[PDB]
Amino acid sequence: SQEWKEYAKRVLDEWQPKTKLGMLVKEGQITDIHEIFRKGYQIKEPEIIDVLLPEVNARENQEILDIALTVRMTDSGRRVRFRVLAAVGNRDGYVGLGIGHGREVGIAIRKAINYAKLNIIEIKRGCGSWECRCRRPHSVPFTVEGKEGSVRVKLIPGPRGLGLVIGDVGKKILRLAGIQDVWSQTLGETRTTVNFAKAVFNALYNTNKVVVTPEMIERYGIVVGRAMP
Amino acid sequence: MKRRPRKWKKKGRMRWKWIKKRIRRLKRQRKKERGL
Amino acid sequence: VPLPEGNQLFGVVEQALGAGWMDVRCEDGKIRRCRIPGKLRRRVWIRVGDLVIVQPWPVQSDKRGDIVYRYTQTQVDWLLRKGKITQEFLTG
Amino acid sequence: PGKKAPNGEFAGRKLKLKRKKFRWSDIRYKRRVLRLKEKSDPLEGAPQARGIVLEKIAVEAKQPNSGMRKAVRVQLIKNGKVVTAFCPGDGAIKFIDEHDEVIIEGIGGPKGGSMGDIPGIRYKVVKVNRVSLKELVKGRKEKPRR
RNA sequence: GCCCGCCGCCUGGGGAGUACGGCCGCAAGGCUGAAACUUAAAGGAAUUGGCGGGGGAGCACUACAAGGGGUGGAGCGUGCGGU
RNA sequence: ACGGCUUUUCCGGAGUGUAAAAAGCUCCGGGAAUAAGGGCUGGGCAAGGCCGGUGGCAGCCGCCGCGGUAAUACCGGCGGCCC
Ligand SMILES: [Mg+2]
Ligand SMILES: [Mg+2]
Ligand SMILES: [Mg+2]
Ligand SMILES: [Mg+2]
Ligand SMILES: [Mg+2]
Ligand SMILES: [Mg+2]
Ligand SMILES: [Mg+2]
Ligand SMILES: [Mg+2]
Ligand SMILES: [Mg+2]
Ligand SMILES: [Zn+2]
């Protein structure tokens, strides 16, 4: 954590913002990661997240989900292209998913990491299982669903200490968001990694779409964004 | 006969109408050899 | 150049039957439906009317056999001059 | 197509009948209940069988592979039927001679059938004259009765 | 599309809408309908190319049209196949 | 490689045990002595880009696929992985 403070300070001085939100963040009018959501802004500069959430650059907070190479046909042979699917997060309350393309693997990886920061979202965590009523943010607070292509995903709250009962792609995505225990059910073709990952991402995003009362926040221990002990 | 519209597609097989005619010719012969 | 050794004997190809099957007339006055091993099938082209070595199958050794070697023009000419085989067997 | 039927509270009989009717379209269920495998299995439901070798053969591989696979014809002692069995190992066919007795078992392909590039062969040899064939192929043991 | 009902049908590709049995029809035919065995795909929608005895637009004397001179027939120089 | 230690287990005794025995259990003497295999090693799926043989042959292969004289996939050596 100490290193990332000075890293964020270093990036902040040598950055020339190009957009309105970048100008606000450079001037110090916006100081916390939570202040850029829920008001319709556009996010086009990756330095915003570097300044506000410096720990998305740690090696342990990034994941290369998949690498594929695809072919376009021409009269002079086959032209090869790389597609990389990647994700980042802070292991507390924020997560992003991105795809990058390039002529070689390194360029594709760099672009995929770059686009994942621009697609960042914040989620809600809690405890809603019938056999664990502990009010601590270790799972999803209620059953949620998401879909992409032919893939359907349903996430179900689980007891503390159970683990992530889901395929590996879901394991990595849910781990980067700060979730420890969950049950799941799926339909469709999960071997298509892109659609699987996007479906889990949509299911996580849909925790913000469920109406809740002030009693429920107390009951399920619902936390938005950073846990903040 | 029962309908199998999958059989009418022409990729990798001969025309279904004439297969049907061939089968019907072959069935007459078995019927006639039975009554003898 | 190599000669038959054992139950092997000469033969004259008469007609190809397809799918790697030939019809060979042997030296013992028998017609045999012979099978070509695939090892030499891919690299040696055989045409009707050639001197070849045929080994009959161990079971039913009267109509089936395997062709093992083909004799070129120089080898068959040398054999004809030496006298191990006659001309009328080749010409029929 | 409308809603799945019947959903009524007092319609259990028709629902059970519907499920029973369409279960016969399942090939796995039909073969077990009618015992279709038992009626045609030359091994009569056994996991291994004992037989006598009649002759040696060689079988060509399927395209696009090239080669010959060494096999034997076996006559089963329990019912007199004749099957073909593969001999695994490098140079294993030398240890088989006509009129030997062998123990054979399945070859382990999909749905209990053939495997690889040798369709038509469903079994393999395991013992020869009550000695393991794997031993003979490696060494460590010598075939009895010369 | 979201919901409340009832009936019919489907369960990898072939063998096969075949064999056997039954009912119906003067006949031609209709309705019902397996197995042994064989096989790793069969099937759908969309993408980039290549191709069409498909359409349009352009171009070239190693294309044509309008022309000038020829080679192909003989003997010889030289290169190639065969013997 | 040096120096030390212990005796579950192993060898020889006394008691107890048992209808009688045998095991077992408590003591005594000797001594590291008496004790590791099976499968796998291209991907699925943990583990070698090493060496020598063979050369679409021999062989492997649940499936996908290897082998055509420069084989990480067959046979053997030396390593390594799982239990
Ligand atoms: Mg082109
Ligand atoms: Mg959609
Ligand atoms: Mg259809
Ligand atoms: Mg009939
Ligand atoms: Mg020209
Ligand atoms: Mg002209
Ligand atoms: Mg001339
Ligand atoms: Mg090895
Ligand atoms: Mg591995
Ligand atoms: Zn809990």
Swiss-Prot record, chain A:
Keywords carried by this UniProt record: Ribonucleoprotein, Ribosomal protein, RNA-binding, rRNA-binding
Keyword Metal-binding tagged: no
Molecular-function GO terms, alphabetical: rRNA binding; structural constituent of ribosome
Keyword Ligase in record: no
Record's signal peptide: none
UniProt cross-references to PANTHER family, sorted A to Z: 40S RIBOSOMAL PROTEIN S2, RIBOSOMAL S SUBUNIT
HAMAP family on file: Ribosomal_uS5_A
Protein name (Swiss-Prot/TrEMBL): Small ribosomal subunit protein uS5
Curated annotation (Swiss-Prot), chain B:
Keywords: Ribonucleoprotein, Ribosomal protein
GO cellular component terms given for this protein: ribonucleoprotein complex; ribosome
Keyword Ribosomal protein among record annotations: yes
Source taxon at top rank: Archaea
Keyword Magnesium applies: no
Similarity section: Belongs to the eukaryotic ribosomal protein eS32 family.
Summary of subunit composition and partner proteins: Part of the small ribosomal subunit.
Miscellaneous field: Initially thought to be part of the large ribosomal subunit. Crystal structures show eS32/eL41 to be a small ribosomal subunit forming a bridge at the interface of the 2 subunits.
Protein name, as recorded: Small ribosomal subunit protein eS32
Species annotation: Pyrococcus furiosus (strain ATCC 43587 / DSM 3638 / JCM 8422 / Vc1)
Native organism taxonomy: Archaea, Methanobacteriati, Methanobacteriota, Thermococci, Thermococcales
UniProtKB/Swiss-Prot annotation, chain C:
Ranges where the S1-like domain occurs: 1-72
Keywords in alphabetical order: Initiation factor, Protein biosynthesis
GO molecular function term, any single one: translation initiation factor activity
Segments passing through the bilayer: none
Known role: Seems to be required for maximal rate of protein biosynthesis. Enhances ribosome dissociation into subunits and stabilizes the binding of the initiator Met-tRNA(I) to 40 S ribosomal subunits.
Membership in a protein family: Belongs to the eIF-1A family.
Protein name: Translation initiation factor 1A
Swiss-Prot record, chain D:
Keyword Manganese: no
One Gene Ontology term, aspect cellular component: small ribosomal subunit
Domain of life: Archaea
A single MF term (Gene Ontology): rRNA binding
SUPFAM superfamilies given in the database record: Nucleic acid-binding proteins
Biological process per Gene Ontology, one example term: translation
Entry keywords, A to Z: Ribonucleoprotein, Ribosomal protein, RNA-binding, rRNA-binding
Signal peptide feature range: none
Pfam families registered for this protein in UniProt: Ribosom_S12_S23
Ribonucleoprotein as UniProt keyword: yes
HAMAP family xrefs: Ribosomal_uS12_A
Record's subunit section: Part of the 30S ribosomal subunit.
Family classification: Belongs to the universal ribosomal protein uS12 family.
Described function: With S4 and S5 plays an important role in translational accuracy. Located at the interface of the 30S and 50S subunits.
Protein name per UniProt: Small ribosomal subunit protein uS12
